[PDB]
Amino acid sequence: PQSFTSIARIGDYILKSPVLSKLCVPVANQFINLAGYKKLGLKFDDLIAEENPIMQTALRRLPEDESYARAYRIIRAHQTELTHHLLPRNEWIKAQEDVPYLLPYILEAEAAAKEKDELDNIEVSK
Amino acid sequence: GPPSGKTYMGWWGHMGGPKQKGITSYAVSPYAQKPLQGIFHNAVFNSFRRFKSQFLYVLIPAGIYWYWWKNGNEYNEFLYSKAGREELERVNV
Amino acid sequence: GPPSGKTYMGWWGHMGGPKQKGITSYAVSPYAQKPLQGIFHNAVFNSFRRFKSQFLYVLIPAGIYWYWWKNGNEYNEFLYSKAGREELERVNV
Amino acid sequence: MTAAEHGLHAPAYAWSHNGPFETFDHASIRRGYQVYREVCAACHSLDRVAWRTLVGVSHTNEEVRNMAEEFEYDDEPDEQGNPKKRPGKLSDYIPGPYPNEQAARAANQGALPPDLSLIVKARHGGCDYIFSLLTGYPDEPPAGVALPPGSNYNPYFPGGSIAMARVLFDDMVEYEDGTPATTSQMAKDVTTFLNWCAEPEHDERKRLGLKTVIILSSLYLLSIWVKKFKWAGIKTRKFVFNPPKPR
Amino acid sequence: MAFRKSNVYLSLVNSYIIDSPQPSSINYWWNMGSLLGLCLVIQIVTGIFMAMHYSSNIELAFSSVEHIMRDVHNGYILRYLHANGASFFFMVMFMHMAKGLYYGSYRSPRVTLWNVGVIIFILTIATAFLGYCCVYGQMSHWGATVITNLFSAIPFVGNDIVSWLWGGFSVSNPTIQRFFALHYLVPFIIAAMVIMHLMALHIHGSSNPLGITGNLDRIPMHSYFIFKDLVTVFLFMLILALFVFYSPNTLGHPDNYIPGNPLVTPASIVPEWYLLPFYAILRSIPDKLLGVITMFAAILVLLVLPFTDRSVVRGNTFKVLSKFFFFIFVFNFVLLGQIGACHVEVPYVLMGQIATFIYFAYFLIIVPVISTIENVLFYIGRVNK
Amino acid sequence: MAFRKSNVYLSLVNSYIIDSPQPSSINYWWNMGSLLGLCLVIQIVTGIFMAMHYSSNIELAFSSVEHIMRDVHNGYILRYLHANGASFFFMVMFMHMAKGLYYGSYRSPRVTLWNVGVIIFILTIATAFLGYCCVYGQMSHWGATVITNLFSAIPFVGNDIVSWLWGGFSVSNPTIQRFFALHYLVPFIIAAMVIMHLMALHIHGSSNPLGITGNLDRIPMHSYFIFKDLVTVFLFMLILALFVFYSPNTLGHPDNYIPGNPLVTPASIVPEWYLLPFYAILRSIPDKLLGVITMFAAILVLLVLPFTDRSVVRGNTFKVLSKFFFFIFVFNFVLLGQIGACHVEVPYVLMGQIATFIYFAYFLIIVPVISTIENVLFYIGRVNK
Amino acid sequence: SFSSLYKTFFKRNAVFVGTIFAGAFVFQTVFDTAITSWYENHNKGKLWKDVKARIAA
């Protein structure tokens, strides 16, 4: 429900600031390590709920190699959580491997939808 | 029949997930397997892994509310005793 | 969802009838029509046509069964009277 | 509330029917019926217990027929429409001593004696509360208790002031089997009898519980095995991913 | 095609039970819905077989239930099955709602499924209340008196609504006969709402504990989840059999075996244990109108859930703060029921008031703030800038 | 697409009521199914509102029905509405079944529809019997005695089944409370069976009075058959209002206002009028086992009719001999009811046996022979050779 | 002779479910007797037969 433009706005304000980065980024790294989605072979851009038109648009515009890789990570996480185990520590997602790949497509489709809404609700200055 | 709305689940054949190439499934017959394989190892080791990862979220708030309830129960039992009737009428009136 | 069996009725667009060609339909708006048009002509004439067409099928079994029930009822009232008790004991024993 | 207003919580005596394979001591039910008929039935009613349910628990058939004949009930009116009495049968119920609530309140200082058919289940504590109420009558109330006239002290009754006087004294009932009837022995017997009158299905219920628990535990373990067997082919899947060629 | 597919009724049975695509990764918390269906079948069958013997007059209600316990063959089995099965119905239903609350099964596709479940929760609360009043013990009369004297707080038509519910001037023979007629009627409305629950679940399928899409790896419901549900069904039968045969009056209050007397107040008017949290939410507000408004708002605050969850991923599976605050909420609900069991005394008034504030601040204050914080931390943990 | 099509539940209401394509040429005989749904809603609502006041004990059944007729505000309205609406339920049910028998609505697509209809017919007969026995008048007690003593003719376990149905040794308090629990329950099985009736109807659509295919000319059900059914809904309400407010005890036997006395035989034990043809088919056979087997076969011989109707055109619209023998069957049914109302006397026994034979020879002998002869006549009237 | 065991009891589903019902009949009788005997033997001296024998002696 929260827009990804809003998350990117707040996150870019936190990352550009020198005090807020050094204060809140290690807490976020520890939050992501404790969340433990990487222990099932998942990046975060697979965790996003894909049942909305913005996310369906982003998954349609995602290229094919990223799509097959994301599909394999989702089926691997389903088999792993079926077995009630974790992935072996050689197969965990590394921190350098957890890159936002779906985020530009999400933000682009989001900007397109917000422009569509703003043009549907204009008032021409007359 | 009439068509329903756009749903996020199809049926067997047209589920609505993405296209899949390269993911290959392997599954051997249960009649060739051992059910109850690993139940003693996963009974004491995997169970401790799951409990160790997921017990602070369940044991800090349970301890918080149980200590709050025990403290309130002891304060009530002190209030309606003979030693604490002055405090009883003070906090009651 | 799953598909169901072969039915003899579709929905709006694929009813499963024959292909239709050359059959041209004309209708008017009811707001530009007279409802209750012809009701006094149909009430005394078309209703008489329908009654002339379909009253032997409804009235000859009614005649047969009502004459049968009336004759059986009159025979029962003869039987449990004073004039027919000899026939009553004969047909009962 | 205060501890006197809650009442003293009754301790946990080791009853002969506490425990998941235990049964009522049926001789204790017999002796408890003796102490009911000789003491408790003067003021307390038993309006839910038929005579026929006593058969095969505490007395025999010819043994209950004599007690039922010793009481009297209302018959169907005679040929002239007059009211008529009748010596009782097995199908009748155990009669209470008072004809109505106002008669009971006239005879017991204005406090209605409750009907003891469900009073083991009707009070928190159960048999422990009944035993502790019957025996826990102090000869003197504690100093400072403003006691009303006609109200005895019992710390197990909620509020302390009960209107039942102490009715169990030593050797007031000559038991049939020569059991030494002290006050606590008679209290154990009536508490077993009142628990039987509360739950007369107790023995058969624990029997069927043993059957049901054995069958359902075996079915639960078999269903776990059948689940793991049906799910083994899915549980031991392996996915490999050789990434496809670009187009 | 197969006969289970081409038939009219067997296609319904097939697409809901046999061929229904369930995700591979759902766990034993997804057995709670099938357990609720089993619970409801148990309640309806045992309740019909006791309504064959129950007499709903005010003079014959308690004695007819006592006749079921004493004269009906295996009638204690039916009575204890009904009472302990209603208690287990609410145990499993609280687990079902808490599973929907944890894994986020209320969110954007399944909002109508969540609202139909909330309607079923209202109807089951009402059915438990009416059937509890059908016994006409001491707790039935005074619980009915309190919860139907609540409606005399409505300013315009309060006494009219109250004397229309009572059928008279207090809880009496009209009220007990209304309550038996409506306690018979309402579980068939619940069964219809369960069918509508199944429709709204069927259009979009179940979620899984990960929250990611289940559309990739999927498993037919027959021969896999039939036996995964059979395991918990037999476990439920085992625990219910223990609670029915060995400790049959644990969850009930012991005052109910006193015959219903309007002139004697039993010094602690307490409903059944599964109504105690909403009873504490009632008693926390020192007003009669605002108390019943707050209790109905406590039940209807579940509908603010898909609009206040500002999280972008579904379910607290990978959220530390959402895990911690969900379990603070669960044990707050337990503390609220434990408060509602108690008397209106000095620490318990403020304890129930603070716990009611926590119960409402979870849906309106905690969840948007914590989920927005988790969105921002999930972004800045892996965006390098 | 529209919200009436895209929603989960409004698509059901749309595809059953609003966009349901009916053939354009159906007549007012197709209104009786909607009228039966209206009768069922009337029966269920007036039944709940009298179950709030009725007491099922054998000392309070008749006294509580008279309490409804005297003390309950508009309770005479509810009681006469329930009773005469049950008579109207069976009138419109006989019209629905007879128009099905006439227009060939039992043939090859709609065999499932016809069989679910027969199941609904059996359940509605059973509901009417139990509800008539709930009043506990003189005809109620003795009708219960006769029709449940019928099952003591089964040679193996007849006494066991009889003393299990009675709950004792005659019709008594457990019998009447059994019958009240069942009379509350079974109409919800009728409502579920009506939903199954609507499924089997929806998969193939309605028939038309011509018997020909209706796929070519069709009309959406809303705004045409909604008001075309509203006409008969108001006409049914008008005739029911006449029979409730002006002649309320015409369709009732006057012996039901005597309280239920087990020691007095009322000199003519007769059920309600809609069960009277089956009572006549019962009494025609001079054996208790073969009599109840023949009554169950009288209800179950409609299942033979899809496989004995040997015709190649559907419906007796265009068949002369089939039309004549269909109305011979209808007036034989009326004769059978008037025979079963009568005493067991000398012309009536032979007339009832002959009418029972004509009833069974319609489905088994008359229909295959007449339809084969009409097939041959339809061939050779237009084939020139 | 596991081949003979399978071919006799588990090949035909009719013989399978027939053996299931036959075993369920024998099981009901024998197991109900065993629980009744164990319950009455555990509670020796407390049942009405023992109280009746004490009255008789």
Ligand code: HEC
């Ligand atoms: C004579 C008068 C008697 C006799 C011989 C017995 N009881 Fe008791 N009893 C009596 C009164 C007036 C009351 C009411 C007390 C009050 O409410 O103030 C009672 C009460 C009980 C109770 C209820 C206790 C409670 O409510 O917590 C029980 C369990 C009880 N009585 C039992 C009992 C037994 C087991 C007796 C003899 C074997 C017995 N009573 C004798 C009056 C009288």
Ligand code: HEM
């Ligand atoms: C939705 C499912 C149901 C629930 C949750 C439910 C709940 C309850 C509860 C809590 C009680 C009180 C039990 C006690 O303390 O004695 C009760 C009693 C009763 N219920 Fe239900 N019930 C349900 C279904 C039914 C149905 C459908 C009927 C009617 C056919 C029914 C008939 C009864 C009867 C007769 C009692 C009387 C008292 C008794 O013997 O328990 N129940 N119900």
Ligand code: HEM
């Ligand atoms: C009589 C009571 C109920 C019955 C029979 C019932 C039945 C079911 C069943 C069978 C399922 C599918 C299995 C599962 O997912 O667990 C389900 C899912 C669900 N139910 Fe219920 N339910 C009931 C009450 C409720 C309540 C009270 C709620 C909460 C408001 C609720 C919300 C849900 C949700 C959200 C799901 C989907 C969970 C998911 O798969 O992600 N239900 N229900």
Ligand code: HEM
């Ligand atoms: C399937 C629809 C139903 C039919 C055909 C039906 C039929 C009947 C009939 C014929 C009577 C006897 C009326 C008389 O002669 O006085 C009756 C009585 C009764 N029915 Fe129904 N009934 C139906 C539905 C219901 C339902 C669902 C209920 C309960 C909620 C109910 C409650 C009663 C009651 C309480 C009586 C008692 C006597 C009276 O007040 O009329 N009925 N029913």
Ligand code: HEM
């Ligand atoms: C509670 C009772 C019933 C209800 C509510 C009901 C409802 C309906 C409705 C609404 C229709 C569609 C409209 C129509 O064709 O008339 C229908 C059709 C039909 N019903 Fe019924 N019905 C009931 C009982 C029966 C019975 C007793 C039978 C006979 C065995 C039956 C057999 C049929 C048939 C054969 C059709 C198809 C008629 C056709 O389309 O030509 N129904 N029913």
